[PDB]
Subunit: 127 residues, 2 copies
Amino acid sequence: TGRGVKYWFCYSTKCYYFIMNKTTWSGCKANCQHYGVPILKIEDEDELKFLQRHVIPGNYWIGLSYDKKKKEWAWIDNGPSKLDMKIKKMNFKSRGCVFLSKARIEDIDCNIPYYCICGKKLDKFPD
Amino acid sequence: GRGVKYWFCYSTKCYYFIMNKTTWSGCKANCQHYGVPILKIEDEDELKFLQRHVIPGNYWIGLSYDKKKKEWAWIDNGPSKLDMKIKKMNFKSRGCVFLSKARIEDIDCNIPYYCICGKKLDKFPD
């Protein structure tokens, strides 16, 4: 048995898991659930840039996917994000998913084996 | 009496930044009130990160001169990897230590400065 190679890291009032095995997007969603820390939602450009400065060079699935039934992009939580403005002006073509790299965010086939970022807001100071 | 305060985590630690000004020991006492002891800094990477993050000012940390046994000591009475660096700064041996963006320094403990509390996380916050 196993699960893979991951580390965790906090920043501001949020913590993340960077899962350093290449899985499909769905697998990334899956793995993140298994730790109760869901696939990453990015709130703003400050957080995006922090992640890109942080990340070891690679490609990381995040919780933004194409809704096949609705014909719209969707975060893991179905909430809006302050990236949406920029994102919708980024004209994502593929009916696929979204990853980040140190350089940017892009859209590609959800079956591509990439790394994976899980994220979760802290509700209170950790005790 | 309490006032302005925020917390922030980085890597595997979280900190409180208490922004009313108090003596060193008021910092020690206020950090305890929140169950997060006055900051102990582990190494130079941590000190640097804190200098970059902090709003310009002076902040008490859990390093004070121990009259009784004649040494600088951290809050938990343990060693820090930052110790060699500290002994090379030629502090006076008297009072307490505060951090600013440019440096850390010894001074009289009863100067009102701001305050940093720190706690190492031991598990992913649940």
